[PDB]
DNA sequence: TAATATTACC
């Protein structure tokens, strides 16, 4: 049994090279019924460690996950690698924002949609 | 928490 009820999202993919924008785009929709409000979305790259991604979701609705599985993404070329998150509710948006961009390499692998939520 | 995995607010 998972399950996660919230309406913030801190998921973190492990080992994983995913564009940060097709990742954001995907998740919109299957995130779709709880009506994301904002998303951001980046792809961590530093020369002495693995590559990773970090999503922060901020819905209108509270999210209710009780599928591990649910926010599994596939890409699309080969090898056709299914990636697994690691699925949170987020306790302090702002932290994780503040994290994860602060994290980043370039802001060529951030990708950001909507308006930020003050929670 | 599962289930990716060393990556995951603090
Ligand atoms: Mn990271
Ligand atoms: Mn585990
Ligand atoms: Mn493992
Ligand atoms: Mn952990």
Same mark, same amino acid.
């Given at each position: 049994?998972?399950?996660?009820?919230s309406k913030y999202?801190?998921?973190?993919?492990?080992?994983? *090279?995913?564009?940060?924008?097709?990742? #954001?785009?995907?998740?919109?929709?299957?995130?779709?019924?709880?009506? !994301?409000?904002?998303? @951001?979305?980046?792809?961590?790259?530093?020369?002495?460690?693995?590559?990773?991604?970090?999503?922060?979701?901020?819905?209108?609705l509270r999210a209710?996950? *009780?599928?591990?599985?649910?926010?599994? #993404?596939?890409?699309?070329?080969?090898?056709?690698?299914?990636?697994? !998150?690691?699925?949170? @509710?987020?306790?302090?948006?702002?932290?994780?924002?503040?994290?994860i961009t602060k994290?980043?390499?370039?802001?060529?692998?951030?990708?950001?949609?909507? *308006?930020?939520?003050?929670?």
């Open positions: 049994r998972f399950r996660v009820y999202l801190f998921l973190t993919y492990p080992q994983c *090279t995913l564009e940060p924008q097709y990742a #954001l785009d995907s998740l919109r929709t299957l995130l779709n019924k709880y009506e !994301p409000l904002y998303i @951001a979305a980046v792809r961590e790259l530093h020369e002495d460690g693995s590559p990773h991604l970090h999503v922060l979701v901020q819905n209108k209710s996950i *009780t599928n591990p599985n649910a926010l599994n #993404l596939r890409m699309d070329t080969s090898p056709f690698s299914i990636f697994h !998150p690691n699925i949170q @509710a987020a306790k302090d948006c702002n932290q994780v924002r503040d994290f994290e980043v390499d370039s802001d060529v692998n951030t990708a950001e949609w909507g *308006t930020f939520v003050a929670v």
